[PDB]
Design a protein around this ligand. Structure first.
Ligand SMILES: CCCCCCCCCCCCCCCCCC(=O)OC[C@H](CO[C@@H]1O[C@H](CO[C@H]2O[C@H](CO)[C@H](O)[C@H](O)[C@H]2O)[C@H](O)[C@H](O)[C@H]1O)OC(=O)CCCCCCCCCCCCCCCCC
Ligand code: CLA
Ligand code: CLA
Ligand code: CLA
Ligand code: CLA
Ligand code: CLA
Ligand SMILES: CCCCCCCCCCCCCCCCCC(=O)OC[C@H](CO[C@@H]1O[C@H](CO)[C@H](O)[C@H](O)[C@H]1O)OC(=O)CCCCCCCCCCCCCCCCC
Ligand code: HEC
Ligand SMILES: CC1=C(/C=C/C(C)=C/C=C/C(C)=C/C=C/C=C(C)/C=C/C=C(C)/C=C/C2=C(C)CCCC2(C)C)C(C)(C)CCC1
Ligand SMILES: CC1=C(/C=C/C(C)=C/C=C/C(C)=C/C=C/C=C(C)/C=C/C=C(C)/C=C/C2=C(C)CCCC2(C)C)C(C)(C)CCC1
Ligand SMILES: CC1=C(/C=C/C(C)=C/C=C/C(C)=C/C=C/C=C(C)/C=C/C=C(C)/C=C/C2=C(C)CCCC2(C)C)C(C)(C)CCC1
Ligand code: OEY
Ligand SMILES: [Cl-]
Ligand SMILES: [Cl-]
Lengths: 27, 244, 37, 442, 334, 137, 33, 97, 30
């Protein structure tokens, strides 16, 4: 679906912040 | 040389009739057999005269000069028609079609605006008998129609009109209508004008002629709301003759 | 329409132009994560 | 000490991180240009004029001569795909280098290298960065000339036979023509540079501008500002930004008028008709219909006394009547065959209107650039049915809004740069309030 | 102490009762030209053929207008967007008939007002103030450009710019609603929110500060005499005002920081009026308000009218009536 | 009220034979009429020649009568003036002129029936609104 | 124009009477000080 | 003695039939076979002294003459009214929809 | 007479502007 990809894509960004805030990263 | 649009545009030259060289004093001979048309007649006014109203006893007022306020929008052009030869040698131009009207408003001293429909609509103009040659002494004289300056759909500022609009002064619901009848009932005038065309230049080679004109007609009467003025117009003309 | 061999990607392509808007929104997720410092 | 909502101001003196911000943002621009083109091509249907399909990028490409043939007909969509793909791929490279410089790279450059590092106050270094970018811009202008003269030409709405792609072999070099445009009035009938109406002048002007920019680029690499220029400007990064905001504003206002009036470098085949064009086309349409019925359109007096179909402009030219009297400066390829030296030629009008001209007028009248925010075509009172807003309205409105805000931003940043330069951008020093040491006014 | 430097020093002097400045060097003559021509035209100009149909509209007091109906009438549609200075007319009589004074006034005024904005920047710099009062004035200024220049550009004629008159203003906004539907356009809706909210917050701020004046006077004297120009201390108690307003609503919907409060005062109406000026400037290119005409239909396909269709009926009445002699063809495309 | 087979029944030809459209055909017809015709014929008028509308009564007085599926399918292939005397494929979209009217290229015979069907059905639903113009908006 | 003749005296007293009131109060304020 | 001549004309046959001397050309769509070709011919060749005069228009084919005959009862003639025929108003009277 | 009245009031306002600016009560610090 279109709503499948804009989900894989929409989650890319907040995923980056999560992985970095957990690994106590240079935010 | 023949100019292009982009040479002319914005100059004022589009409102001017073609001229002929002052060398052009020939004659164009007419074959009573052959038929002819005017392929282009151009009339360029240069002066607008309005008859004043002397008010006192029969003094007969003068034609006074006026200022044009509507700019270079005045010339009649691309007029065409039959040029007939009549039994008695006279020639008659019968206008068929063309850009044969321009609204004009000139301003009198004191500030009165005078609109008029400068026209030669339905022009029929004729020479003396026994022409046989168009020359620099040939005159055409004729008459034409002057329809109402506004046509029938025109709505005045309170919405009244002839073919459209209110038939009363709706803003005065209980006023006495008798006094308002002239403003309320629109009328479509159709009057006649007179023109003389004087040929002063002739190119025998090319069928072109040029010269001077004077016409007389009535001004706008605002669909019967007020009395028209007499107007006298002078200018120059150009016409191209062709065998049909 | 796209060339047939990329046909597979039509719905991805319907979505791509919106992606630069997501970068603006991502700036505010990041700032929320660090507490608008 | 900037707040989070002014946080990009923290980058003013971090040349490294500021470079990443610029390069990342450049990736965003190239990304949208690629993604958007692909989106448009995915939705494109060649049986439909581009302007019925909400397209703004594909028309830019077609104007350069790719994908189209005689009449604007689309013949090959592969060039469109290529342009979109290559932009999209390139945004990955710009994105890569921008996040590297923004995040991982040297925070400041001036230690890593004296060539890439810069202080905003170093007037020599600033004019050398400017000079490089001038040269780059000049090259870009010459690329347009190269396309036009050596790689296939450009689309020419004016070409005989309905428009076509055409190689430009004699670009205009005459500076009286090229710089003559820059001196024409911006008012009606003149139109300043927006009136450029032929590709020869377009290509020639880009020759000039390419040379001028390269010349000026070399000038600024090799010079330092003279003292009159040193004492007239503020020399700070925010000041420089403010100068560029004003220039972008001016440019966006111009582009607004360009896409609204010009039908040469925005061909109406691709962008739809201009407003003046659509209005002229309606008068043409009813002139044609009525003349076929027997009307003598030259002698027909309308309600006002002015011609119903034809009248004179203030300088005498024969023009279309009705409200479109305002639009008589319009010029387009479907109408010019009717124009003689005094304006519209009544003999051509009576005898020489062709079916293709009837079609074009009917098409353009019914695709006037009027429509609603939700894309209902037509005047505000029209019912739903036609899904249409002209690309010219979308491009005009968007670029007006953008240009306005950038003028606001110029004022914002110019005033602030002046105040921070003089040292009172954070407020008035209580102990040294200037007004308190001035005499009173009365 | 050379002639030029002395002149420069007078032009930029902060001792002048009214500041001149470099922007003032342009502002003063252009505003005087616009003002003097406006007063004379409004009183005595003859009728102007605004729609180019030789139907002159009388706008001045001597030709039968009052203050409410009078206007300086826009230039003729026959001119469109052509530049019509005096020296381009064959006579003043011509220039007056075709609407020349309008063009003279609006161009001088827009120039003068643009310089007014710059002059606000300039004096702020000479007095060591922060610079952005001129940005607040860009909202009204943008609005004047929209109705006098941008909208005439997009439509092709200064004859469709706003008349310089009270009833002419109304004519302008009625015809705008029929041709664009400004009311259903979100940028106008934000302009309303900007000016309504602006009036609201004006009253709020005025009433809250006035509510919390510190007692400094007797009941026989104006409380205004409790404040002396230049006193260092505040004249009201902001904590009392906040204590009242935060209870009127709840605590966190009330400001306790006067700087944020006054920035908010500035921002809301300025930004709303930016949008409404951009509304006019984009309806100049005919990107009009929402059209929900016949959007609701039933199972069979009958149209089910909404209030939007009722709006459309009113718009139709404005459309068919305006400039009643000026259209020969069915579509009013500009 | 609803879109019943009665409303969806329309003359097939001049003999008086009738055809019953499906709801699907009708909506197909409406959609294709928007795609190819409404730029000039929104609401059943004709913007570039308002004297000629798409009212059933007007189509009935056309030569060849056009108030039926066959007449309208023919018109979309080979349009004539109202008195039938002159062919106007060069200035009116038709399959005959699909080269100059490119939106007609991809229209199939069943698309034409659906468009004709929409035109004969809509006045049964909308009455005077169909072809009446702004007076009835 | 056929305006209301009494509009003139209406306008004149509407201006005059409250203006005089203010001037009276102003002048007697100055002569205290 | 001040009368609206268009309203007066509505009280003649012009108010009930197609007036071959005055009516705008769009009325000829009310009857089959008449518009545009015959309507163009009829308007160009006005005025007519009687409704039957229309059958003498030079050029009519037999099919055209027969169409006119079928419709003669829908026609009338009254005196030409200037207000209705000037301005090219028989071709476009300013009324669309 | 109406024209005279309108213009008279307008001119009185302009005159008031002049006094209000050049003959104002001067603001004086504390
Ligand atoms: C540094 C400071 C600058 C100081 C400079 C001050 C003096 C400049 C004055 C600027 C104002 C000019 C008004 C524009 C008038 C108008 O007709 O402008 C439009 C013209 C285009 O003119 C049109 O140009 C046309 C060109 O098309 C012609 O040629 C075309 C060729 O394809 C087509 O053929 C077309 O059919 C044919 O007509 C014709 O000439 C038209 O008649 C003519 O109207 O655009 C223009 O010159 C292009 C640029 C104009 C920008 C003006 C917009 C200003 C925006 C105001 C910003 C407000 C900000 C708010 C602040 C708070
Ligand atoms: C090339 C353009 C450019 C550049 C590089 C800058 C750079 C800067 N500006 Mg300027 N600015 C610009 C244009 C520009 N500006 C324009 C055009 C305006 C007028 C609107 C301004 C007005 C302005 C103000 C008023 C201020 C700045 C400030 C600043 C600094 C900090 C900004 C920051 O961190 O933003 C942080 C970013 C945000 C808070 C996000 C903003 C959100 C926007 C408004 C929403 C846009 C949404 C969009 C319309 C789509 C909506 C759809 C939805 C799905 C989201 C920085 C130096 C500040 C300053 O003076 O610092 C010195 C400051 O106070 N700018
Ligand atoms: C800045 C230039 C610009 C212009 C002129 C256009 C113009 C257009 N786009 Mg494009 N587009 C743009 C930027 C632009 N877009 C960007 C940045 C994106 C990424 C989000 C897109 C994504 C996009 C898609 C996905 C689609 C379009 C479509 C369209 C068309 C319909 C627009 C519409 O209905 O909007 C409705 C109007 C609004 C939503 C107005 C929003 C008001 C803003 C928020 C105010 C902001 C004020 C401050 C700045 C139109 C031709 C459509 C189309 O027809 O495709 C072929 C479509 O489907 N565009
Ligand atoms: C085009 C938009 C843009 C860009 C390019 C930047 C860029 C930058 N900002 Mg600004 N900013 C923006 C918008 C933008 N900002 C807006 C809208 C706001 C308002 C909320 C701010 C507010 C803001 C603040 C408050 C600050 C900055 C700062 C900075 C810099 C350091 C940020 C950092 O270390 O984050 C670290 C972030 C992370 C580690 C999280 C992940 C971020 C990555 C880059 C996301 C990339 C996603 C993408 C899908 C990857 C593709 C990779 C592929 C190409 C291989 C950086 C150069 C900071 C600064 O000046 O430093 C001194 C700072 O203090 N910004
Ligand atoms: C204007 C953009 C710009 C600028 C000014 C800089 C500047 C710099 N970069 Mg960055 N960088 C950029 C873009 C930019 N970069 C991009 C787009 C990428 C992603 C591919 C990177 C990735 C990158 C990395 C990975 C590193 C740098 C490093 C550096 C520094 C030294 C570079 C050096 O010695 O090479 C000098 C010159 C060369 C190596 C020659 C390269 C020839 C180029 C590629 C030709 C370009 C062609 C054309 C002009 C533009 C592209 C064409 C396209 C438009 C179609 C310097 C501060 C280094 C650094 O800071 O480390 C501490 C480092 O390791 N950069
Ligand atoms: C991005 C482009 C750009 C930028 C930002 C600069 C920036 C600068 N240049 Mg360079 N320059 C450039 C391109 C650029 N230049 C190019 C391409 C050339 C080659 C032609 C030059 C040639 C050049 C010379 C020869 C000189 C500069 C100088 C300067 C400095 C002063 C500029 C100044 O005072 O302008 C303000 C402008 C004026 C005071 C004059 C205004 C005159 C114009 C024509 C008025 C028109 C305004 C009007 C509203 C718009 C209509 C346009 C009109 C022609 C119709 C400044 C650092 C000076 C310097 O210090 O050099 C070291 C200097 O002497 N520049
Ligand atoms: C000393 C102080 C007085 C001077 C102050 C200024 C005077 C202001 C006058 C205002 C009224 C002028 C109107 C024009 C009247 C005039 O010219 O014609 C004069 C008109 C009378 O009208 C005359 O009548 C005549 C036959 O008798 C003829 O018909 C004349 O044509 C007709 O003009 O005067 C009035 O009727 C005035 C009295 C009306 C008062 C009752 C109205 C109550 C309305 C409620 C108002 C509350 C609003 C409060 C707002 C808060
Ligand atoms: C403008 C570009 C049009 C398009 C698109 C469509 N039509 Fe049209 N139509 C148009 C005109 C100017 C005319 C009158 C033609 C003439 O001179 O006689 C018409 C006429 C019709 C008719 C006849 C109506 C009648 O009362 O006899 C029909 C049935 C018709 N048009 C149908 C039609 C269809 C189905 C279209 C989409 C395929 C279509 N038209 C498009 C102008 C335009
Ligand atoms: C092209 C392509 C690609 C690319 C992609 C990318 C580049 C992506 C990115 C992405 C991103 C870039 C994303 C992001 C997103 C984000 C988001 C999703 C956000 C959200 C937000 C929000 C929701 C917010 C909220 C909030 C907050 C947080 C705070 C305050 C409040 C508020 C509410 C604002 C790929 C790889 C696929 C491959 C293929 C193709
Ligand atoms: C710094 C920062 C920031 C910013 C960021 C940025 C802005 C970046 C960007 C980046 C980018 C800019 C990115 C890009 C990317 C891209 C890519 C990754 C792409 C890919 C592609 C592909 C893979 C393709 C594919 C294809 C093809 C090839 C063909 C067709 C189809 C398709 C499409 C599928 C922020 C604000 C957030 C925060 C803070 C920090
Ligand atoms: C390409 C082209 C072309 C051409 C172009 C050209 C060639 C251009 C030029 C351009 C130019 C050549 C421009 C210029 C500009 C300039 C300006 C824009 C200026 C500015 C200035 C300023 C802004 C200033 C300021 C100041 C002052 C005044 C004082 C002191 C301070 C200062 C310095 C700040 C044409 C059209 C043909 C065609 C098309 C293409
Ligand atoms: O709205 Mn309706 O549209 Ca803009 O033009 Mn056509 O008419 Mn006229 O002159 Mn002023 O007004
Ligand atoms: Cl009006
Ligand atoms: Cl019109």
């Amino acid at each position: 679906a279109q709503l499948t990809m804009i989900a894989m894509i929409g989650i890319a960004g907040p995923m980056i912040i999560f992985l970095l805030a957990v690994r106590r990263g240079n935010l | 040389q023949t100019l292009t649009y982009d040479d002319i545009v914005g100059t004022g030259l589009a409102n001017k009739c073609p001229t002929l060289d002052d060398t052009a004093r020939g004659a164009y001979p007419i074959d009573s057999s052959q038929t002819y048309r005017i392929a282009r007649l151009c009339l360029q006014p240069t002066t607008f005269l309005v008859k004043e109203e002397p008010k006192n006893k029969r003094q007969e007022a003068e034609f006074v000069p006026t200022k044009l306020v509507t700019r270079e929008t005045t010339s009649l052009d691309q007029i065409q028609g039959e040029l007939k030869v009549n039994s008695d040698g006279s020639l008659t131009f019968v206008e068929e079609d063309g850009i044969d009207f321009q609204p004009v408003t000139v301003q009198m001293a004191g500030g009165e605006r005078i609109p008029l429909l400068f026209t030669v609509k339905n022009l029929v103009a004729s020479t003396q008998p026994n022409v046989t040659s168009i020359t620099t002494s040939t005159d055409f004289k004729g008459e034409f129609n002057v329809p109402s300056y506004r046509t029938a759909n025109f709505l005045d500022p309170k919405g009244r009109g002839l073919a459209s609009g209110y038939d009363s002064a709706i803003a005065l619901p209980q006023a006495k209508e008798e006094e308002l009848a002239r403003a309320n009932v629109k009328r479509f005038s159709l009057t006649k004008g007179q023109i003389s065309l004087n040929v002063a230049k002739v190119d025998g080679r090319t069928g072109e002629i040029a010269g001077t004109f004077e016409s007389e007609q009535l001004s706008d009467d605002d669909m019967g709301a007020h009395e028209p003025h007499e107007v006298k117009i002078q200018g120059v003309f150009y016409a191209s003759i062709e065998p049909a | 329409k796209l060339p047939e061999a990329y046909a597979i990607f039509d719905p991805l392509v319907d979505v791509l132009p919106v992606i630069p808007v997501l970068f603006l929104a991502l700036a505010f997720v990041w700032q929320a994560a660090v507490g608008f410092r | 000490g900037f707040a989070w909502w002014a946080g990009n101001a923290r980058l003013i003196n971090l040349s490294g991180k500021l470079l990443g911000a610029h390069v990342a943002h450049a990736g965003l621009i190239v990304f949208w240009a690629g993604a958007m083109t692909l989106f448009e091509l995915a939705h494109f249907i060649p049986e439909k004029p581009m302007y019925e399909q909400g397209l703004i990028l594909i028309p830019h490409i077609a104007t350069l001569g790719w994908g189209v043939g005689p009449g604007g007909e689309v013949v090959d969509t592969f060039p469109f795909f290529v342009v979109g793909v290559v932009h999209l791929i390139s945004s990955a490279v710009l994105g890569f280098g921008g996040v590297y410089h923004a995040i991982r790279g040297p925070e400041t450059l001036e230690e890593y290298s004296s060539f890439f590092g810069y202080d905003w106050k170093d007037k020599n270094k600033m004019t050398t960065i400017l000079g490089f970018h001038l040269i780059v811009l000049g090259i870009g202008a010459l690329l347009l000339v190269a396309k036009a003269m050596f790689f296939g030409g450009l689309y020419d709405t004016w070409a005989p036979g309905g428009g076509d792609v055409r190689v430009i072999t004699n670009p205009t070099l005459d500076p009286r023509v090229i710089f003559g445009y820059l001196l024409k009035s911006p008012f009606g009938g003149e139109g300043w540079i927006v009136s450029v109406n032929n590709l020869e002048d377009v290509v020639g002007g880009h020759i000039w501008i390419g040379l001028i920019c390269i010349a000026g680029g070399i000038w600024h690499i090799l010079t330092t500002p003279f003292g009159w220029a040193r004492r007239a400007f503020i020399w700070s990064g925010e000041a420089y930004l403010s100068y560029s905001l004003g220039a972008l504003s001016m440019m966006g206002f111009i582009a607004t008028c360009f896409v609204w009036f010009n039908n040469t470098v925005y061909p109406s085949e691709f962008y739809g008709p201009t407003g003046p064009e659509a209005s002229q086309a309606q008068a043409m349409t009813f002139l044609i219909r009525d003349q076929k019925l027997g009307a003598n359109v030259g002698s027909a007096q309308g309600p006002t006394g002015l011609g119903k179909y034809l009248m004179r402009s203030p300088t005498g030219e024969i023009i279309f009547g009705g409200e479109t009297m305002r639009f008589w400066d319009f010029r387009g390829p479907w109408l010019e065959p009717l124009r003689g030296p005094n304006g519209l030629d009544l003999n051509k009008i009576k005898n020489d209107i062709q079916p293709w001209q009837e079609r074009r007028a009917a098409e353009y009248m019914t695709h006037a650039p009027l429509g609603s925010l939700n894309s209902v075509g037509g005047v505000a009172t029209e019912i739903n049915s036609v899904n249409f807003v002209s690309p010219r309205s979308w491009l005009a409105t968007s670029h007006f809004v953008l240009a306005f805000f950038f003028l606001v931003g110029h004022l914002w940043h110019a005033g602030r740069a002046r105040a921070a330069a003089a040292g009172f951008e954070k407020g008035i020093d209580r102990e040294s309030e200037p007004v308190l040491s001035m005499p009173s006014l009365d | 102490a050379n002639l030029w430097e002395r002149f420069c020093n007078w032009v930029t002097s902060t001792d002048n009762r009214l500041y001149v400045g470099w922007f003032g060097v342009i502002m003063i003559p252009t505003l005087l030209a616009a003002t003097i021509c406006f007063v004379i035209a409004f009183i005595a100009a003859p009728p102007v053929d605004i729609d180019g149909i030789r139907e002159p509209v009388s706008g001045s007091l001597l030709y039968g207008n009052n203050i409410i109906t009078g206007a300086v009438v826009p230039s003729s549609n026959a001119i469109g967007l052509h530049f019509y200075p005096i020296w381009e007319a064959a006579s003043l009589d011509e220039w007056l008939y075709n609407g020349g004074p309008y063009q003279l006034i609006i161009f001088h005024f827009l120039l003068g007002a643009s310089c007014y904005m710059g002059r606000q920047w300039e004096l702020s710099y000479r007095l060591g103030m922060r610079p952005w009062i001129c940005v607040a004035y860009s909202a009204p200024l943008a609005s004047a450009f929209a109705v006098f220049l941008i909208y005439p550009i997009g439509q092709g004629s200064f004859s469709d710019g706003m008349p310089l008159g009270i009833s002419g203003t109304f004519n302008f906004m009625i015809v705008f609603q029929a041709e664009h539907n400004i009311l259903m356009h979100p940028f106008h809706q934000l302009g309303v929110a900007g000016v309504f909210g602006g009036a609201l917050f004006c009253a709020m701020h005025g009433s809250l500060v006035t509510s919390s004046l510190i007692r400094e006077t007797t009941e026989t004297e104006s409380a205004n005499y409790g404040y002396k120009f230049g006193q260092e201390e505040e004249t009201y108690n902001i904590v009392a005002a906040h204590g009242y307003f935060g209870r009127l609503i709840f605590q966190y919907a009330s400001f306790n920081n006067s700087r944020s409060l006054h920035f908010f005062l500035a921002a809301w109406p300025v930004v709303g009026v930016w949008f409404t000026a951009l509304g006019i400037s984009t309806m100049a290119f005919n990107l009009n308000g929402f059209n929900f005409n016949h959007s609701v239909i039933d199972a069979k396909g009958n149209v089910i009218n909404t209030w939007a269709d009722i709006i459309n009926r009113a718009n139709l009445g404005m459309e068919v009536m305006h400039e009643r002699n000026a259209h020969n063809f069915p579509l009013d495309l500009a | 009220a609803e879109l019943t087979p009665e409303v969806l029944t329309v003359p097939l030809n001049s003999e008086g034979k009738t055809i019953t459209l499906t709801e699907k055909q009708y909506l197909e017809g409406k959609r294709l009429f928007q795609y190819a015709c409404a730029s000039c014929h929104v609401g059943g008028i004709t913007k570039t020649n308002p004297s000629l509308d798409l009212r059933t009564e007007t189509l009935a007085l056309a030569t060849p009568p056009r108030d039926n599926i066959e007449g309208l399918v023919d018109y979309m292939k080979n349009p004539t003036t109202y008195d039938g005397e002159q062919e106007i494929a060069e200035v009116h979209p038709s399959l005959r002129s699909a080269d100059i009217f490119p939106k007609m290229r991809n229209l199939t015979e069943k698309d034409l029936v659906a468009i004709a069907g929409h035109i004969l059905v809509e006045p049964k639903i909308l009455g005077d609104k169909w072809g009446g113009g702004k007076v009835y908006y | 124009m056929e305006v209301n003749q009494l509009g003139l005296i209406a306008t004149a007293l509407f201006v005059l009477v409250p203006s005089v009131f203010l001037i009276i109060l102003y002048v007697q304020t100055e002569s205290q000080q | 003695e001040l009368v609206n001549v268009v309203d007066e004309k509505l009280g003649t046959a012009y108010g009930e039939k197609i007036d071959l001397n005055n009516t705008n050309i769009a009325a000829f769509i009310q009857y089959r076979g008449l518009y545009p070709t015959l309507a163009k011919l009829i308007v160009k060749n006005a005025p007519y002294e009687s409704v039957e005069d229309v059958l003498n228009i030079p050029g009519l084919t037999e099919r055209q003459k027969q169409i006119l005959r079928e419709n003669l009862e829908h026609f009338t003639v009254t005196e030409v009214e200037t207000a209705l025929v000037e301005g090219g108003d028989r071709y476009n009277n300013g009324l669309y929809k | 007479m109406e024209t005279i009245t309108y213009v008279f009031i307008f001119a009185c306002i302009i005159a008031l502007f002049f006094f209000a600016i050049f003959f104002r009560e001067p603001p004086r610090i504390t």
